[PDB]
Amino acid sequence: NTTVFQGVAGQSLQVSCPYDSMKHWGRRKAWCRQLGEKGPCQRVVSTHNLWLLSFLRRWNGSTAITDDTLGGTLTITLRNLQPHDAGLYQCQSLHGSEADTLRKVLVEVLAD
Amino acid sequence: EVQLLESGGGLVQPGGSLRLSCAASGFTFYSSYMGWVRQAPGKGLEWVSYISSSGSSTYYADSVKGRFTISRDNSKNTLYLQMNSLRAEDTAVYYCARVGGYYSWGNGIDYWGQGTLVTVSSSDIQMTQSPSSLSASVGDRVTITCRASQSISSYLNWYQQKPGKAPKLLIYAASSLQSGVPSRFSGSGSGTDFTLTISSLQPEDFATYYCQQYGVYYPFTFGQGTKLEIK
Ligand SMILES: *[C@@H]1O[C@H](CO)[C@@H](O)[C@H](O)[C@H]1NC(C)=O
Question: Which residues take part in binding a 1,2-diacyl-sn-glycero-3-phospho-L-serine (chain A)?
Answer without folding.
Answer: 48-49, 58, 69
